[model samples]
Target: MFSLRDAKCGQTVKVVKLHGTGALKRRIMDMGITRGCEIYIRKVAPLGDPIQINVRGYELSLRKSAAEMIEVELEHHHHHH
Candidate 1:
């Protein structure tokens, strides 16, 4: 689980540390969302609108799976042993 896409529920995440930047850049647009991903982010909106996505007003909005690429849960997760 690369410590990502898991904290979208109710946790704070930081996208584009370095490598993810390049990866998500290709997944979508660099100026469009690459930065916007950090700006908007994939989270449950204030009104429970977790189905919308805004890429810095670049593409406007997208689907759920679309935002799945911009994973950046700048933290840790223990699967345990």
Candidate 2:
């Protein structure tokens, strides 16, 4: 298990757990990132602060801090030539 922030680009990961409390955790769930949900890493900013992902047929951007609070399991390893 690893945090979502460690997930690489083009990889698909499943939400395992959400770390933190109060509004932070609530906000994460509000974005449809509950446990067992699938998240696709679309891209990351060049500086690696904001991460873009596809979830529930929509695109969402998560800050690095928020991503750190998310526990995820790697589902598919995407190899790019």
Candidate 3:
């Protein structure tokens, strides 16, 4: 999809390309959301809300705008326990 923000909650996604490189750019990589990495998404309220996702082993919460900066591809076949 265009970005992780487009992915619904409860979806696992693989990072594709990042369309942003501002203040949060460094943070994104620090969180292990690098290209080709898989992340587990978990939240987004009705309107504006932060996204709480499994950015590798631990949970990381990013604003929807932050999530929008990260592009992602589908990972429907990636299974995990």
TM-scores, one per candidate: 0.37, 0.85, 0.79
- Per-candidate total of colliding backbone pairs: 0, 0, 0
lDDT of each: 0.45, 0.87, 0.78
- lDDT, residue 57, model 2: 89
> Which stretches of candidate 3 lie above 4 Å from their native place?
78-81
RMSD of each: 8.4, 3.8, 2.9
Question: Which candidate order results from sorting by TM-score in descending order?
Answer: 2, 3, 1
Which portions of model 1 show Cα errors greater than 4 Å?
Answer: 2-12, 17-27, 35-37, 41-50, 57-59, 74-81
Model 3: per-residue Cα lDDT over 25-57, one tens digit each: 777777677888788887866674688888768
Give the Å shift of residue 31 in candidate 2. Answer: 1.5
Q: Which ten residues in a row have the lowest lDDT in candidate 2?
A: 70-79
Candidate achieving the largest lDDT: 2
* lDDT (tens digit, per residue) of candidate 1 on 1-81: 432333455444456632344655565554454532544334544443343433445424444444455546544456677
TM-score of 1: 0.37
